[PDB]
Amino acid sequence: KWDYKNKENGPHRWDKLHKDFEVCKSGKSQSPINIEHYYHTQDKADLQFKYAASKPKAVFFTHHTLKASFEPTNHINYRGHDYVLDNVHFHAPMEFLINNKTRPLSAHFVHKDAKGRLLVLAIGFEEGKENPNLDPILEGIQKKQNFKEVALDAFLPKSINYYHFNGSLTAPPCTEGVAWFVVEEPLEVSAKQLAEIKKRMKNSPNQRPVQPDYNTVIIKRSAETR
Amino acid sequence: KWDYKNKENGPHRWDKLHKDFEVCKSGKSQSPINIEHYYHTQDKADLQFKYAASKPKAVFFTHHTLKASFEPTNHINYRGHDYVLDNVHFHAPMEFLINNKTRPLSAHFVHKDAKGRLLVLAIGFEEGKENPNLDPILEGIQKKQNFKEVALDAFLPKSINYYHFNGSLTAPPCTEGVAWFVVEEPLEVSAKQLAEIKKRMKNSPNQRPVQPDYNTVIIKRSAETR
Ligand SMILES: [Cl-]
Ligand SMILES: [Cl-]
Ligand SMILES: [Zn+2]
Ligand SMILES: [Zn+2]
Structure with missing residues (x-):
């Protein structure tokens, strides 16, 4: 039963808990890392968003995180191909x-495309003003069902800059082949919302430690989300 | 013994010949690929070559390739680490x-640095002028020992453009974590030299087929070799 503690089931031993998890240790592009060495480009965008306000399929606690899953109606388009948004979850x-x-x-x-290839966008929050985009998720977890719309098309800023590179899922089974999009600009979250989200995640940090970095090639990029 | 034929020892089954070879199949950053999506960078790389004329330790046919191995006196410095040149071989x-x-x-x-990390530079040849830099290798593979200097310093152009990304070894054990540098402009080789080198590799292609590309992030960059 994998977790984020430093005992038998912690990240240092995830690889031992199941054969499927062996790449958590043996992989050469495990995530997360510290993003510090990266390149710049004047190339045009290759990322477009096709997000719309959407009622979650489910808002629930699983795999140590608070997760809102969605019906397959939202997509990111990357290199001309659609990747369907499966869920939003928190760390x-x-x-x-x-x-x-x-x-x-x-x-x-x-996200996942028709071929099953993974694309994950990460974006941080800084403590600050109330973010009304989070309220349908906070209201939805403590509610039975009939989940309210999440404003997916208002969640990110208009212009983003992001770090783009290949890595892995950050939880078991740590599968590689992931295209990461780590947004530089933070969103806001209030102290109250931050406490509430952390409490929904059992006041138990669910942050995988940084993993060995084998010269990960990272390009800094921009895109418009509208 | 693994090979490039397609009975019980070829590319599709490399992973089954030894547990050391399993990433040949399970890896998600396997090489080679078709390089066609890449981000152009404008600044000249810090990449520093430390190559000099070097007598091979051995010029030999091994694992389906013509290989020249060297004493550990040549390196590429990348991100402040020295990657020592082990060998040059052909595909x-x-x-x-x-x-x-x-x-x-x-x-x-x-190449490999002291911390054990891999760096491979690939450069293609196109049929054209006789390449004098190949001659000590072409002579050496016909010699018992006492191999003549390979002009490692002359082998590449002073200015290069390359594609840079994370991948794998292209032969078993297919180890990932490889920092690849694939040079854009081909060197020349005469038709006679080309036929000769192919004969020394038993007129038997030793090219791994293109592997699945899980959105490999590739930059295009310039460097000077001196
Ligand atoms: Cl993150
Ligand atoms: Cl090649
Ligand atoms: Zn996650
Ligand atoms: Zn090779």
Whole structure:
């Protein structure tokens, strides 16, 4: 039963808990890392968003995180191909570091294309003003069902800059082949919302430690989300 | 013994021949691929070559390739680490494709730093002028010992453009975590030299087929070799 503690089931031993998890240790592009060495480009965008306000399929606690799953109606388009948004879920603290800076919370937007290839967008939160985009999720977890719309098309800023590289899932089975999009700009979250989200995740950090970095090639990129 | 034929020892089954070879199948950053999506960077790389004329330790046919191995006196410095050149060996046809174009031959310059991390430079050849830099290798494979200097310093152009990304070894054990540098402009080789090198590799292609590409992030970059 894998977790984030430092006992028999912790991240240092995930590989021992099941054969499927062996890549958690043996892989050469495990995530997260500290993003510190990266390149710049003047190339045009290759990322477009096809998000719309959507009622979650489910809002629930699973795999140590608070997760909102969605019907397959939202997509990111990358290199001309659609990747359907499966879920949004949270990590506290944020898992990726950017020039050794941490954030107290991040969201992962998890996508998959028709071929089954994974694309994950990560974005951090900084403690600040109330973020009304989070309220349908907070209201939805403590509610039976009939979940309210999540404003997916208002969640990110208009313009984003992100770090783009290949890595892995940050929880078992740690599958590689992941295209990561780690957004530089933080969203806001209030102290109250931050406490509430952390409590829904059992006040138990669900941040995988940074993994060995085998010269990960990272390009800094921009895109418009509208 | 693994090979490039397609009975019980070839590419599709490398993973089954030894548990050390399992990443040949399970890996999600396997090489080679067709390089066709890449982000252009404008600054000249810090990449520093420390190559000099070097007498091979051995010039020999091993694991389906013509290989020249060296004493550990040559390196590439990348991100402040010295990657020591172990060997130069050949593939026919060239294994990486660039915008779907093939070359009849490539060389791999295989390196490892002290911390054990891999760096391989690939450069293709196109039929044209006689390449004097190949001659000590072509002579050496016909010699018992006392191999003449390979002009490692002259082998590459002073200015190069390359594709840079994370991948794998292209032969078993298919180890990932490889920092790849695939040079854009081909070197020349005469038709006679090309036929001769292919004969020394038993007129038997030693090209791994293109592997699944899980959105490999590739940058295009310039460097100087001195
Ligand atoms: Cl994160
Ligand atoms: Cl190649
Ligand atoms: Zn996650
Ligand atoms: Zn090779």
